[PDB]
Enzyme design. Structure first.
Site, PDB file in Angstrom:
ATOM      1  N   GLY A 260       0.764  -1.229   0.000  1.00 58.98           N
ATOM      2  CA  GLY A 260       0.000   0.000   0.000  1.00 58.98           C
ATOM      3  C   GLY A 260       0.799   1.287   0.000  1.00 58.98           C
ATOM      4  O   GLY A 260       2.023   1.282   0.080  1.00 58.98           O
ATOM      5  N   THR A 261       0.079   2.398  -0.099  1.00 55.98           N
ATOM      6  CA  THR A 261       0.654   3.737  -0.089  1.00 55.98           C
ATOM      7  C   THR A 261       1.407   3.965   1.218  1.00 55.98           C
ATOM      8  O   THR A 261       1.128   3.327   2.231  1.00 55.98           O
ATOM      9  CB  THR A 261      -0.464   4.792  -0.217  1.00 55.98           C
ATOM     10  OG1 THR A 261      -0.497   5.287  -1.557  1.00 55.98           O
ATOM     11  CG2 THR A 261      -0.265   5.922   0.768  1.00 55.98           C
ATOM     12  N   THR A 262       2.366   4.872   1.209  1.00 55.92           N
ATOM     13  CA  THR A 262       3.097   5.117   2.431  1.00 55.92           C
ATOM     14  C   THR A 262       2.359   6.181   3.249  1.00 55.92           C
ATOM     15  O   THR A 262       1.754   7.104   2.697  1.00 55.92           O
ATOM     16  CB  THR A 262       4.557   5.524   2.119  1.00 55.92           C
ATOM     17  OG1 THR A 262       5.248   5.806   3.340  1.00 55.92           O
ATOM     18  CG2 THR A 262       4.596   6.739   1.223  1.00 55.92           C
TER      19      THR A 262
ATOM     20  N   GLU B  83       0.587   9.535   1.485  1.00 57.22           N
ATOM     21  CA  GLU B  83       0.856   9.603   0.054  1.00 57.22           C
ATOM     22  C   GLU B  83      -0.416   9.255  -0.715  1.00 57.22           C
ATOM     23  O   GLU B  83      -1.036   8.233  -0.457  1.00 57.22           O
ATOM     24  CB  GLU B  83       1.957   8.589  -0.288  1.00 57.22           C
ATOM     25  CG  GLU B  83       2.313   8.449  -1.766  1.00 57.22           C
ATOM     26  CD  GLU B  83       3.294   7.305  -2.030  1.00 57.22           C
ATOM     27  OE1 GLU B  83       3.853   7.232  -3.145  1.00 57.22           O
ATOM     28  OE2 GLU B  83       3.501   6.468  -1.130  1.00 57.22           O
TER      29      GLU B  83
ATOM     30  N   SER C 164      -2.444   2.206   5.693  1.00 55.63           N
ATOM     31  CA  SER C 164      -1.913   1.744   4.415  1.00 55.63           C
ATOM     32  C   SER C 164      -2.398   0.324   4.205  1.00 55.63           C
ATOM     33  O   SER C 164      -2.428  -0.475   5.150  1.00 55.63           O
ATOM     34  CB  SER C 164      -0.383   1.741   4.430  1.00 55.63           C
ATOM     35  OG  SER C 164       0.131   3.031   4.700  1.00 55.63           O
TER      36      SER C 164
END
Lengths: 243, 250, 241, 244, 198, 244, 242, 111, 233
Positions: free
Chosen positions: F30-32, F47, F75
């Site tokens: 996943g996104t940070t 993010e 995330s």
């Protein structure tokens, strides 16, 4: 046929692998702990290992305050340890409300042990990968140590140790008692019993500890509390001035 | 969530065997030996207190439990299972009997209730049989003294003397020799300790042994006085000291 | 609690549990039913795997649902009971609410429904049973004969048979039953029935039971002799040629 | 989910058979043999105690013959524990009938209910069937002396003489060889012991390995009577019938 | 209330039941049969609350017929009455209890004796030579107590009955529009269609 | 044997629970997103990948609030994250209703912990596919926490999870050292915007959108709020600068 | 095994797909719609000469202005028809008007996916999908004459003509050509009869085939043997005519 | 004790012409001898050329109208925005009311 | 591999995937293309309706949920009926209880949370349908894309279904232009029809195969089919 290894049912040998593997999980934390009984107090020591710098060291613990009198140290993953802690706390609050007196350490152990025994028999409940050490100064039994495992077993001890190096700790203590001939540390103050605990933990593991390498809990008549990094340091400084 | 294990975990194999029950029995054979001897004026049940650590305190754990004031129980197999069974047993003795009739249940009936609890764990959805076998000894005004054995299947049978666990075969044989229909309680206790000796490897003393008897009534253990018809429990667990004194005339 | 879907579709569009249920029927004793011009007869065979039974008490194959309707079957006996009970109960309930006994077709549609329901409901297996339901609608004299199967499907027959070797006895019936002229006599109707059973019973005086249903709740089961007599008059037909 | 460990105890084989029932029966086939013979003036129930010892208390033991009513009794072959669950519900059933109608429950009525209970564990619930077969010996004022049998399947039938458990094939053959409709209870009693004696896996047929019961009409009364023989009563009859 | 009379003679039981059906100010019917046949040799008469009355009778009928079909046998009169009592006794502690009173007249084909059972909405059951529910007994019992004899013939019965019905037409305030009489005996149930001048 | 990784509550022979471990994989993919604990509050940042020009800017908000003083970011599987927040809102509402005081942050942590740990006890449930950084200000100051699919959680000085979690941890660790006396809310906001930009290198393919929120005793009054407008553009600049 | 509500890697629900297979084995059923009414025909298919062919009900009345034909495991269709009739009747009770043909269809389709062993969304109690399809034919004041095909999938389509069952693919191909918006009811009748004859293994007579229709004036009616026989005859003649 | 009902007064009138219809009502809402409002609309346009008014106990009257309008809304969803005939509305309203037969909407409604 | 982890949604793959959901997602790609786009004054939905035979009808792809909100589907028709019906209830509930029009963004959250419930509990199955929701609320025109995984997103425009990537590129390309088509619905629609045609192949859009829906400032959500969409082909 081979699913006798995925749920709590018997294997042809009469075994319960899932219970065995649960025991395996108790060491995940790679932390040892031990408890001893004083003349009228009970102490539990446990290693504390906080390597990540981003963690708030103060929010890391495996020692719990179940009630004003019962203290519980857990050997196993924190999520299961916290599930057990919450339950014991509830069981203690309730017991007081219903029966009119504070739940005794041994009774809370039995109740928790029975709860574990169930996950052992009912198939949809998984055992908890933890070994619970309950301590207090029972108003009837005095300093008490009762530990329970994923198997639903439990018993009281003179002193006990748990973790990867449980054996090293145990035999060290066995020896000490074979020597003293008594079932406890003949010390009036708990500060000294704590020092005894940390000392033998060092001898058995062959390791030195700083104030942030340990976690300590003390149970006395009508109160169980844990020490601070400083309360510990003072204790550590003391044993140093004996060696 | 919601237990979706609504089906049986113990079923029939093509050979007609009920696996889980068999396995449970296996678990019982692995267990520490425990026995029972019925005399003319009493019964005795005993086992070894296999302390699992020199730091443990064997007394805090009892393998010989009082169910009613005239019924005792001992086992071989899984301790935890036996423990909950003892609580259920003590309760069923009340809910299904003492609360209806105002008197404790007779041995055979309680044994029957216990047996039912086990039978169910053999057929009910999502569970495994109990991994223990029990030896219940009691006495009731109309049936006198009795000794029973209850298996993981829910089956039970009356005995004059028997053993279960590790050295059941050997022990059962030693009992068949020494038993007769003219034993007094002291004799059964003697034969008991002798039989148990063979099964014990290391220390054999009042601290590594647990033994109780169902015999006379113990007014001194009643707790109150003033009710003629209430004379005391027939169940009495021997003390470490009581055991040792006997071991000397062994 | 237990609701596992035991009857479901497989790649080829089959529902094996219902099919295997039918297999149980094939293994069951034979049952036959033939309607006359003013009666319906039901016949069933009796196994011989063991003989030392007490025919007085051992449950018979032809069951009465109401005073004017009967049901025989082929398949699992334990299963048949549950269907018979539910049918008998629905019979009384229909009288109680509609103030009129069930028609044979209705009692059939009901039994068939129960079976169908057990093929698309969780936690249950289909009834390993096929049935023959016959009788006369209230205040009517036109004989009624129906059949049901585990699938839940049903229909009416001039004559029909289910159970082991039913294939055989059906053949017999297909070339021995003329709709143009149905057995105008209870006797000549009970004859055609015993004849069809004999094709598979292999000499079974006590292995054959018959029950005759006439209009207006007139149901009676014949005794060995009465039946044994039919068997006789029949074996002569053969020899006399 | 859980579907993974579901044995599916209630399904048809491709041949239209019920696995568990089949297997349950296979289980029953190893149980001590039980025989029931119905005479013209009474019924006899005889069973062989499976597994015994010098120490096994016999006066207190009852692993195969249970009284259900004052006029009905059963002989068990299979899981004793499963049997009792069924036994008890039956006893309740008899008392409910009596409480509702003020008449003792007709023998078949009781047998059909118990069989129905069994039939159930066969069609729904995902549970294992009861590993038990029953031989019912009872008496009522509609069919007089009756003898029935029910197994894990939930099916039941009537018999003049029958056996359940181990070596039934052999036992059946022998009964079908010496049974006669005119038999008198004592004739049936003797035939029963002979059959067991010949089908036993044991050395000799001693009393300590037997359970016995008779439902006769003690002429000096006009009513029927159940009697579960005691160790000595079985020991006596054993000597008389010539098995000593 | 309605007249529900019953008398057990030598070889049968006779049940007389008023025919009138009044609803407030108007008498709606004068030919009502307050009876239900539970089985070929068992008949039950009834009186009480408006809806409950028939609802109960038919419910009992349905059940007794189901028992007959299932066991292919006719329960004794005693057994039927016991069943009926159990049912009323339940109703007594239910949410809305059946307010019905019944007389059960049957011929036990096994004992070969006639039997009369009286049961009220409380489930109070008693077996009697003769009986009645409501006020009917108040005018008739003295007559029956006097002339009743265990070996009376069905004819003598119907006479002692006519005698009772007359006392009811004399001293009772309401016009019950006469009774419908029925006999239950070894041969079954039949209705004495001519009692309007017998 | 094997297959210890197909059912959720199963212990493998070495004491693990693979299903939980596989859940973690969804998280790492996943996104940070991170959290920085300042001297009187906490800052959250995440993010937001711009899959395409078609995404309306600033419109698909990720950070969620619990009650009025708590902030949550995660995330992994977004829907699993919302689900967890919903439970959190219920959990906090229940608590306040009975005790009046808005739920303490530590208490909130255990509520989520216990809940997430619950989804590792049965095979009829799937563990959560998200790691959650959350915190707020209460009667005892600021608290920052991170919760794992296993149910494990601890208090942090700085926390990161997701694709660029390593960069973040590296940068966070630096801050810890270069600020032994504490970081201010205003400064944590900038420092947060920077870490996200840096951690965006392990995903430098797709263009992204920054999102920050904070809960400061002196800047927000202890109430959780989103950093927007100028203070936002400001941190974006401080970051865009130090990335060159 | 594998859940009864599982998806295939192709994004399809297994049980539903297999369901569709059992339907292909079903007896032929055909429907033709014309501005003069809708015709519904089916293949009886008796499994023996002893089976009284008119006890085969594969065309039933939902309401006076709605009827339907089934194909597949016909026992399954019993409850579907119950629901359907109850819906039509209930709508009338609650709105004092006739239920639209499409709504009636949508209602039946709504039961379709109501299966599973514990599907999160409500309480779908039914262990498997239905193994039968239906051609719902009717008329209403809103969209006049209509023909609908409803499947165990839960979806439905409106057709001018549609064939389901063992002979479908071929029969459908035929319909594609034979059908035109100016057909007359009689024409439709013969067309149905003809196509049934072509796909039926059996020599089509008035005993193994059944016709029926639904028109605004007389509603839904099932042709009696005599009436159909004549149409069959009338067909043989016109065919052998060239 | 608690009385769940009240009276807000009001009076309504409905007259039907050959090709039209009218529904009128005063706009006064009251409680005992006090006036709650001199203008509180009581007759409503529910769509599909249907006007309705549930007079009597206002809480109940509002509940009903609201519930009916919603019924019209779903009628469109379920039957393709098909116009709800006055007769159909009437039958629907009957079910709405009888649905609370044992704790009724204390209103006299006219459409 | 996959075979051992795609039997249900309560199982994670060794890499953290949920195949049952991924499979559900496939049902959408297999569906008929549908496009959505919005300016500042309107939101438009354009859909390609698919038929079975030429004797059958074309499947409706657009459903109205309230006077200010509606959607288009791609995938399992039934599921769209289930979800759109739940969305209708939510819109309804917001009005009865709060006398408030349900915000498009909020509807999106509710849908998301509902879809997610069938991806974490045994027994359920993911929904096998994609949805494009358009609506005009207190903050203007909106367009949302709903995926069975539970992921709901707000976009200026997008498309789902077979060959959908075609239109999505066209939109992603035309963006700066159509997003400014305010006060002129006819244009926004032509822009939508041009976008969807970039996903054609088999055939060309006809009058009984094209489905268009619109909602805006003073425009209640309305659907156009048949001759209604003639002026756009």
């Amino acid at each position: 046929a081979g699913y006798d290894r995925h749920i709590t049912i018997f294997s042809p040998e009469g075994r319960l692998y899932q219970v065995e593997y649960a025991f395996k999980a108790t060491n995940q934390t790679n932390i040892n702990s031990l408890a001893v009984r004083g003349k009228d107090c009970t102490v539990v020591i446990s290693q504390k290992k906080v390597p990540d710098k981003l963690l708030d060291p103060t929010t890391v613990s495996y020692i719990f305050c179940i009630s004003r009198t019962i203290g519980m140290v857990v050997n196993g993953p924190i999520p299961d340890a916290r599930n057990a802690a919450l339950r014991a706390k509830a069981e203690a609050a309730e017991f007081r409300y219903k029966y009119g007196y504070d739940m005794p350490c041994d009774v809370l152990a039995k109740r928790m042990a029975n709860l574990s025994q169930i996950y052992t028999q009912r198939a949809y409940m998984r055992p908890l990968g933890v070994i619970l050490t309950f301590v207090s100064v029972d108003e009837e039994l005095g300093p008490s140590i009762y530990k329970t495992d994923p198997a639903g077993y439990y018993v009281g001890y003179k002193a006990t140790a748990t973790g990867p190096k449980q054996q090293e700790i145990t035999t060290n203590l066995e020896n000490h008692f074979k020597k003293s001939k008594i079932d406890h540390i003949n010390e009036e103050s708990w500060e000294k019993v704590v020092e005894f605990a940390i000392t033998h933990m060092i001898d058995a593991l062959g390791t030195e500890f700083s104030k942030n390498d340990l976690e300590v809990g003390v149970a006395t008549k009508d109160k169980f509390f844990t020490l601070s990094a400083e309360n510990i340091e003072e204790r550590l400084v003391a044993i140093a001035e004996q060696d | 969530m919601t237990d979706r294990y609504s089906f049986s975990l113990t079923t029939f194999s093509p050979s007609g065997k009920l696996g889980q029950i068999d396995y449970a029995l296996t678990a019982v054979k692995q267990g520490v030996t425990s026995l029972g001897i019925k005399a003319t004026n009493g019964v005795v049940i005993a086992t070894e207190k296999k302390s699992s650590s020199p730091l443990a305190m064997s007394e805090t754990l009892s393998k010989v439990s009082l169910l009613t004031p005239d019924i005792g129980a001992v086992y071989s197999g899984m301790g935890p299972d036996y423990r909950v069974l003892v609580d259920k047993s003590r309760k069923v003795a009340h809910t299904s009997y003492k609360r209806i009739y105002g008197e404790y249940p007779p041995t055979k009936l309680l044994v029957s209730e216990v047996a039912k609890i086990m039978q169910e764990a053999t057929q009910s959805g999502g569970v495994r049989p109990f991994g223990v076998s029990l030896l219940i000894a009691g006495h009731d005004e109309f049936n006198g003294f009795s000794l029973y054995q209850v298996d993981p299947s829910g089956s039970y049978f009356p005995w004059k003397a028997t053993a279960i666990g590790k050295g059941s075969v050997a022990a059962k044989t030693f009992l068949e020799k020494r038993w007769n229909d003219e034993l007094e309680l002291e004799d059964a206790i003697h034969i008991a300790l002798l039989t148990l000796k063979e099964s014990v490897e290391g220390e054999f003393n009042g601290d590594t042994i647990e033994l109780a008897i169902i015999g006379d009534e113990n007014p001194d253990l009643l707790g109150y006085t003033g009710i003629p018809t209430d004379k005391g429990p027939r169940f009495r667990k021997l003390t470490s000291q009581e055991i040792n004194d006997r071991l000397e005339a062994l | 609690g237990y609701d596992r879907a035991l009857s479901i579709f497989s790649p080829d569009g089959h529902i094996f549990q219902v099919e295997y249920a039918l297999e149980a029927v094939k293994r069951g004793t034979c049952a036959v039913g033939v309607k006359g011009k003013n009666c319906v007869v039901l016949g069933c065979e009796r196994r011989s795997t063991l003989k030392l039974q007490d025919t007085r008490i051992t449950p018979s194959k032809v069951s009465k649902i109401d005073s004017h309707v009967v049901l025989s079957f082929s398949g699992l006996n334990a299963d048949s009971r549950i269907l018979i009970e539910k049918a008998r109960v629905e019979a009384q309930s229909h009288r109680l609410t509609l103030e009129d006994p069930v028609t044979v077709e209705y009692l059939t549609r009901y039994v068939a429904g129960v079976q169908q329901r057990y093929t698309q409901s969780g936690g249950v297996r289909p009834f390993g049973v096929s049935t023959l339901i016959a009788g006369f609608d209230p205040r009517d004299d036109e004989p009624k004969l129906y059949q049901t199967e585990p699938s839940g499907i049903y229909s009416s027959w001039s004559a029909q048979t289910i159970g082991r070797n039913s294939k055989t006895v059906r053949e017999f019936l297909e070339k021995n039953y003329d709709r143009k002229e149905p057995p105008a006599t209870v006797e000549e109707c009970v004859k055609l029935t015993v004849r069809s059973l004999l094709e598979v019973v292999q000499t079974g005086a006590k292995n054959i039971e018959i029950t005759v249903v006439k209009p207006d709740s007139d149901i009676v089961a014949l005794s060995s002799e009465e039946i044994n007599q039919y068997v006789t008059q029949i074996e002569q037909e053969k020899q006399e040629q | 989910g859980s579907r993974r460990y579901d044995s599916r105890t209630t399904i048809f084989s491709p041949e239209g058979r019920l696995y568990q029932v089949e297997y349950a029966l296979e289980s029953i086939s190893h149980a001590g043999t039980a025989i029931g013979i119905m005479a013209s003036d009474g019924i006899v129930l005889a069973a062989e105690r499976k597994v015994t010892s010098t120490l096994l208390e016999q006066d207190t033991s009852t692993e195969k013959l249970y009284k259900l009513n004052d006029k009905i009794a059963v002989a068990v072959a299979g899981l004793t524990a499963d049997a009792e669950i069924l036994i008890n519900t039956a006893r309740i059933h008899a008392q409910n009938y009596l409480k509702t109608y003020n008449e003792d429950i007709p023998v078949e009525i009781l047998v059909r209910r118990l069989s129905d209970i069994k039939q159930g564990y066969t069609q729904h619930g995902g549970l294992r069937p009861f590993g038990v077969s029953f031989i019912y010996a009872g008496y009522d004022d509609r069919y007089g002396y009756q003898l029935y049998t029910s197994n894990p399947s939930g099916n039941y039938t009537g018999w003049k003489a029958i056996s359940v458990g181990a070596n039934t094939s052999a036992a059946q053959t022998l009964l079908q060889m010496d049974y006669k409709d005119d038999m008198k209870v004592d004739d049936a009693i003797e035939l029963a012991l002979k059959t067991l004696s010949k089908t036993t896996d044991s050395s000799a047929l001693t009393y300590d390995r037997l359970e016995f019961a008779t439902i006769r009409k003690g002429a000096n009364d006009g009513e029927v009577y159940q009697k579960i023989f005691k160790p000595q009563e079985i020991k006596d009859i054993l000597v008389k019938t010539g098995i000593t | 209330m309605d007249i529900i009379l019953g008398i057990r003679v030598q070889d049968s039981v006779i049940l007389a039941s008023s025919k009138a059906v009044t609803r407030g100010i108007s008498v709606l019917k004068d030919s009502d049969d307050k009876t239900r046949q539970l089985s070929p040799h068992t008949l039950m008469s009834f009186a009480g609350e408006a809806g409950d009355t028939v609802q109960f009778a038919e419910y009992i009928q349905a059940n007794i017929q189901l028992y007959s079909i299932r066991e292919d046998y006719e329960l004794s009169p005693q057994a039927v009455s016991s069943f009926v009592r159990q049912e009323l006794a339940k109703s007594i502690r239910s949410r809305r209890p059946y307010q019905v009173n019944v007389l059960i007249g049957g011929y036990d084909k096994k004992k070969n004796k006639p039997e009369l059972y009286q049961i009220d909405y409380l489930g109070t059951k008693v077996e009697l030579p003769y009986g009645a529910h409501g006020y009917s007994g108040f005018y008739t019992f003295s007559l029956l107590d006097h002339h009743y004899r265990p070996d009376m013939t069905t004819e003598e019965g119907l006479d002692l009955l006519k005698l009772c019905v007359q006392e009811l037409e004399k001293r009772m305030p309401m016009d019950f529009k006469g009774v419908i009489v029925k006999i239950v005996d070894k041969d079954g149930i039949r209705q004495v269609d001519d009692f309007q001048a017998q | 044997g094997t297959g210890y990784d197909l059912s959720n509550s199963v212990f493998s022979p070495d004491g693990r629970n693979f299903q939980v471990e596989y859940a973690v994989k969804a998280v790492e993919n996943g996104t940070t997103s991170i959290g920085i604990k300042c001297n009187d509050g906490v800052v959250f940042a995440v993010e937001k990948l711009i899959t395409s020009k078609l995404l309306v800017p600033q419109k698909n908000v990720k950070i969620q609030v619990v009650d009025r003083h708590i902030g949550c970011v995660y995330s992994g599987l977004i829907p699993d994250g919302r689900h967890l927040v919903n439970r959190g809102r219920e959990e906090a509402a229940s608590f306040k209703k009975l005790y009046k005081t808005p739920i303490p942050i530590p208490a909130f942590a255990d509520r989520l912990g216990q809940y997430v740990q619950a989804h590792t006890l049965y095979n009829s449930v799937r563990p959560f596919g998200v790691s959650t950084i959350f915190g707020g200000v209460d009667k005892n100051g600021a608290h920052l926490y991170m919760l794992e699919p296993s149910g494990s959680y601890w208090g942090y000085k700085g926390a990161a999870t997701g694709k660029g979690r390593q960069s973040a941890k590296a940068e966070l660790e630096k801050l810890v050292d270069h600020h032994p006396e504490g970081l201010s809310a205003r400064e944590a906001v900038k420092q947060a915007a920077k870490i996200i930009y840096l951690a965006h290198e392990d995903n430098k393919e797709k263009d992204f959108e920054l999102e920050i929120s904070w809960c400061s005793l002196s800047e927000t009054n202890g109430l959780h709020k989103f950093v927007k407008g100028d203070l936002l553009q400001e941190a974006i600049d401080f970051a865009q600068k130090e990335i060159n | 095994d594998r859940g009864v509500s599982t998806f295939s890697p192709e994004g399809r629900l297994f049980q539903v797909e297999y369901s569709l297979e059992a339907i292909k084995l079903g007896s032929t059923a055909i429907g033709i719609a014309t501005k003069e009414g809708v015709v519904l025909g089916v293949e009886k298919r008796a499994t023996s000469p002893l089976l009284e062919s008119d006890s085969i009900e594969k065309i039933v009345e939902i309401d006076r202005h709605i009827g339907c034909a089934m194909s597949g495991l016909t026992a399954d269709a019993r409850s579907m028809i119950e629901h359907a009739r109850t819906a039509a009747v209930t709508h009338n009770l609650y709105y004092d008007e006739d239920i639209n043909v499409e709504s009636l269809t949508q209602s039946v389709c709504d039961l379709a996916l109501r299966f599973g062993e514990g599907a999160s969304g409500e309480e779908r109690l039914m262990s498997r999908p239905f193994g039968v399809a239906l051609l719902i034919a009717g008329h209403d004041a809103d969209d006049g004459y209509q023909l609908f095909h409803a499947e165990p999938s839960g979806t439905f389509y409106r057709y001018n003509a549609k064939a389901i069952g063992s002979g479908s693919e071929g029969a459908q191909a035929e319909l594609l050509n034979e059908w035109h918006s100016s057909l007359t009811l009689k024409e439709a009748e013969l067309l149905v009869l003809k196509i049934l004859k072509q796909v039926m293994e059996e020599k089509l007579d008035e005993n193994n085939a059944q016709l029926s229709c639904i028109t605004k004036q007389d509603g839904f009616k099932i042709y009696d043997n005599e009436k159909t026989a004549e149409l069959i005859k009338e067909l043989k003649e016109k065919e052998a005519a060239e | 004790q608690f009385n769940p009902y009240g009276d807000n007064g009001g009076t309504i009138l409905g007259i039907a012409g050959e090709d039209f219809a009218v529904l009128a009502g005063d706009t006064r809402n009251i409680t005992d001898y006090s006036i709650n409002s001199r203008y509180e609309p009581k007759v409503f346009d529910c769509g599909d050329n249907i006007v309705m008014s549930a007079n009597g106990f206002a809480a109940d009257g509002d509940a009903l109208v609201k519930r009916f309008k919603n019924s019209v809304k779903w009628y469109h969803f379920d039957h393709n925005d098909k116009k709800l005939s006055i007769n159909s509305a009437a039958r629907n309203i009957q079910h709405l009311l009888y649905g609370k037969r044992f704790f009724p909407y204390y209103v006299h409604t006219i459409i | 591999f996959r075979n051992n982890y795609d039997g249900d949604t309560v199982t994670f793959s060794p890499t953290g995937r949920l195949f049952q959901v991924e499979y559900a997602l496939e049902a959408i790609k297999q569906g008929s293309v549908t496009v959505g786009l919005r300016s500042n004054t309107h939101a438009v939905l354009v859909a390609l309706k698919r038929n079975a035979d030429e004797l059958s009808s074309y499947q409706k792809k657009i459903i109205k949920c309230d006077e200010h909100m509606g959607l288009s589907l791609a995938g399992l028709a039934p599921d769209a009926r289930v979800l759109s019906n739940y969305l209708r209830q939510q819109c309804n509930y917001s009005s009865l209880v709060f006398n408030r029009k349900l915000a498009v963004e909020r509807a999106g959250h509710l849908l998301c949370d509902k879809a997610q419930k069938n991806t974490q509990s045994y027994g359920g199955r993911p929904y096998g349908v994609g949805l494009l929701i358009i609506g005009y609320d207190k903050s203007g025109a909106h367009l949302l894309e709903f995926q069975p995984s539970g992921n709901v997103t707000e976009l200026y425009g997008t498309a789902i279904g077979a060959r959908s990537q075609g239109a999505k590129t066209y939109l992603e390309r035309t963006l700066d232009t159509f997003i400014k088509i305010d006060g002129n619905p006819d244009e926004l629609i032509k822009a939508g029809v041009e976008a969807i045609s970039q996903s054609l192949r088999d055939e060309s859009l006809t009058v009984d195969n094209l489905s268009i829906a619109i909602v805006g400032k003073d425009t209640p959500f309305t659907i156009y089919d048949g001759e209604a969409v003639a002026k756009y082909i």
